[PDB]
Structure 1
Amino acid sequence: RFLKVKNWETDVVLTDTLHLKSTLETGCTEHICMGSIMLPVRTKDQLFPLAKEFLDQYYSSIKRFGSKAHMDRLEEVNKEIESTSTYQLKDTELIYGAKHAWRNASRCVGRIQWSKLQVFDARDCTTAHGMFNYICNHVKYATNKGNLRSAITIFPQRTDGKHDFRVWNSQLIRYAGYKQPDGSTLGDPANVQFTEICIQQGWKAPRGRFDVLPLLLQANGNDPELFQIPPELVLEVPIRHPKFDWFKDLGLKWYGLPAVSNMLLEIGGLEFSACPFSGWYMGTEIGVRNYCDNSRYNILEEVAKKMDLDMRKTSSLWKDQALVEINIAVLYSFQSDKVTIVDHHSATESFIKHMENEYRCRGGCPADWVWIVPPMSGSITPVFHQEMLNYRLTPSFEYQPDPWNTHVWK
């Protein structure tokens, strides 16, 4: 069954056959669409089918489907599962798996880049100190002094779910949030709870507006351990504006490297609960969301005040005006310091080219419109006008509950 998607700005119509490979469920029904909902131990039984599907895909991509090496590997994986209850991926299969999880990520606008991903195999890691070393090396490699490179570090897979490797941070680099007795927050309000956990575990908090959080790292189901990323490894960009000299005096900065560390990577039925990955920012992530969300740094008031915009009525669009200038400054700052960044026009335009290419050569590109359309200037980016089909392919990155909720303390 073929499904059509239309771009309403160009009249380009595309045909999706890839959705027929989708197994996992969307949350939607014939009777209800959950498209705007944020979040809508395996048996040996279910594991070999999942292994088989994955390996069939892998061997098909390398043009060896049904070859002797394909049949033998299926055989070897079967036996390993029966004998040991799990299995180990080859290096080739891990790299392939990790790239495909990225390629399959519906909510990622940056996927044109999917095949250029540096994979760090951390499956020989045994301790939190070992994790910290792996992570520092990833941070250094990915940073590359501002010429950002995409990377993922993959720690050992789940076994019985009692011995998980977890990075407790949501991102490798994030700023502390501090809830004051007067109810105000200092620093990043999104990180209050995790900051509290870090302090509880013995972190001495500087209590500033931009304190880089420590890593809290869980190896082998053990209680997690604190580590401070070497600050010389943390590339930051102070934010200034090309025409507005007063912008610098707001005291804003951001870190160059976006590195998600709380997701779970599924490949051939196996579960890698610690698999931090990083790319580079789209400007709006910092300038719209991090700075301007009401529940985040919330700087709109202060910026419009300094711009002397009319703030007595929403209809002056003082908010929209400030929002643009803040985003201009973010991009100008990164560019000036030669730290890789992409504006939302360029990033969305390249996504459309990617998407079309994926249709022509793969039969589809699952894409989540709610997430792909940037959070400012939506309809002047070409994605707004693009019909998209959202469905779930494996390999995949999934959310997982925060470990402080599930972890059994020793």
Structure 2
Amino acid sequence: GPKFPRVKNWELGSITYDTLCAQSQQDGPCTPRRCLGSLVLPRPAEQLLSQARDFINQYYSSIKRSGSQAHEERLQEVEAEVASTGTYHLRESELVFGAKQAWRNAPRCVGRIQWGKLQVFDARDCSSAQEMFTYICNHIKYATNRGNLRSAITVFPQRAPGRGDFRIWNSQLVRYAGYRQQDGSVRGDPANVEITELCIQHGWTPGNGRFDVLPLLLQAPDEAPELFVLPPELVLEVPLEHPTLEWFAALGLRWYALPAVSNMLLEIGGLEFSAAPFSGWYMSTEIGTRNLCDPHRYNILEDVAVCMDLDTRTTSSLWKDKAAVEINLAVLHSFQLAKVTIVDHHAATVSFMKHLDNEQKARGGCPADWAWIVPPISGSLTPVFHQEMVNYILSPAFRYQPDPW
């Protein structure tokens, strides 16, 4: 056969070869001697220019003007810019293309069937924390759209050599506070204890609920981060109820509509956008299974199973499984009731399979992180479980970056 990874779908028996991986200009953490594909985290003008040239080539390919005069002119314009400044700047349409391509290229995102439909907000003119806040508020308003969620990304100015970064300190635009208690337990989201304490140290009067929306800690270059409280009316939340378990509503659970990652680095052509929050809509298991049922998160599995009167004293009763299913159903039912976009893990994974087929034809493959694409409940009940996947890093890319503090 061909010398490219052979990729099998075990449910269907179909075979594809990934040739796209040939485009990867960046090494992952795996070697022939060991696979580290389950690790969450991994671990100069000449370099910039090659990355720039490569991106400009991608861009001109995408507009079908590869090799053209404008392509060569743009390439030269970029070299000369890097020549005199040590950096360069993207044209608006390049930024739009690059942002979309970074999403398209994101191995961990199951939502990529939507990749061509991304509203890119250019906020590269932003010059203060206050303006960052306005742009973020605007983003949230646009993306939330009163429950009819729209994918969006707001791109703040790129890392500039000699100058400090724009950084959103929160990992998400909307996340709930986590308050460490005397007993050592946490009220709210344990994931967010550190950022919550930073909000308080920076002047935020903290609530004491399990679902207090965190304020934004926004950092303009070479300034201390500034604190901005999101106006409650901008943050759409959904009270959780269950379609058949009437008591479920009395748990007082809720989640926010808008999943917006705010601390990833968007890298395009060697340029680094350290603040480029993007948002899509939730896949229900992100909330139902991970946020609400993770032992290190809200960890509500036992609470719900007890209310369901399950035998929580034995693993074989599958109480964790029964309760998790009902929480997930409650999440779906409540978002649907509240008319807030949400996709269940079956619809999401079916759409990702369609995406894989599209991308096979468009690009000869699709980088995908199986561990992340397969949902955290009902894994093999979704088609992606049976789909071998090849993981590799393509640029443009979203990258994790260390917390600014």
Letter in 1 for 2:7: V
Which residue number corresponds to residue 332 of structure 1? 333
In structure 2, what is the Cα distance between the partners aligned to 1:253 and 1:63? 47
Report the alpha carbon displacement of residue 162 of structure 1 after superposing the two structures with TM.
4.1
CA distance in 1, matches of 2:138, 2:41: 32
**Corresponding position of 2:13:** 11
Instruction: Give 1:24's match in structure 2, choosing from 10, 23, 26.
Output: 26
Q: Percent identity?
A: 69
Structure 1 stretch 75-84 or stretch 276-285: which is displaced more?
75-84
Deviation at 1:82, TM superposition (A): 0.6
Counterpart for residue 285 of structure 2: 284
Question: Structure 1, residues 271-330: CA drift from partner, whole Å, max 9, x if none?
Answer: 000000000000000000111111111111111111111222110111111110111110
Deviation per CA, 1:137-179: give whole Å up to 9, x if none.
0000000000000000000000126410000000000000000
Check if 1:246 corresponds to 2:247. Answer: yes
Q: Distance in 2 between matches of 1:303 and 1:17?
A: 47
* In 1, Cα distance between equivalents of 2:226 and 2:370: 38
Q: Matched residue of 2:87: which SS?
A: coil
Using the TM superposition, give the Cα deviation of residue 182 of structure 1 relative to its aligned residue in structure 2, in angstroms. Answer: 1.1
Work out which of the residue numbers 38, 41, 47 in structure 1 matches 2:40.
Answer: 38
Letter in 1 for 2:29: G
Which residue in the other structure is 1:71 paired with? 72
Q: How does 1:9-408 map to 2 (within 5 A)?
A: 9-40=11-42, 43-160=44-161, 162-404=163-405
Q: In structure 2, list runs of 5 or more residues that go unmatched.
A: none
**Partner of 2:401: helix, strand, or coil?**
coil
SS of match in other structure, 1:208 = coil
Long gaps (5+) in structure 1? 405-410
Q: Distance in 1 between matches of 2:36 and 2:60?
A: 35
Distance 2:371 2:395 in 1: 21
Q: Secondary structure at the match of 1:123?
A: coil
* Secondary structure of 1:216's aligned partner: strand
**What is the CA–CA distance in structure 2 between the aligned matches of 1:333 and 1:188, rounded to whole Å?**
20
Amino acid at match of 1:60: S
Paired amino acid for 1:165: F
Q: Secondary structure at the match of 1:14?
A: strand
Q: Which runs of 4+ in 1 moved over 4 A?
A: none
Q: Secondary structure at the match of 1:275?
A: coil
Separation in 2, partners of 1:347, 1:161? 43
1:403 match: secondary structure: coil
Residue identity matched to 1:31: R
Q: Do the aligned residues in 2 keep the contact of 1:266 with 1:272 (CA within 8 Å)?
A: yes
The 2-side partners of 1:375 and 1:161 are apart by: 43
Q: In structure 2, what residue type is equivalent to 1:39?
A: L
Aligned length: 402
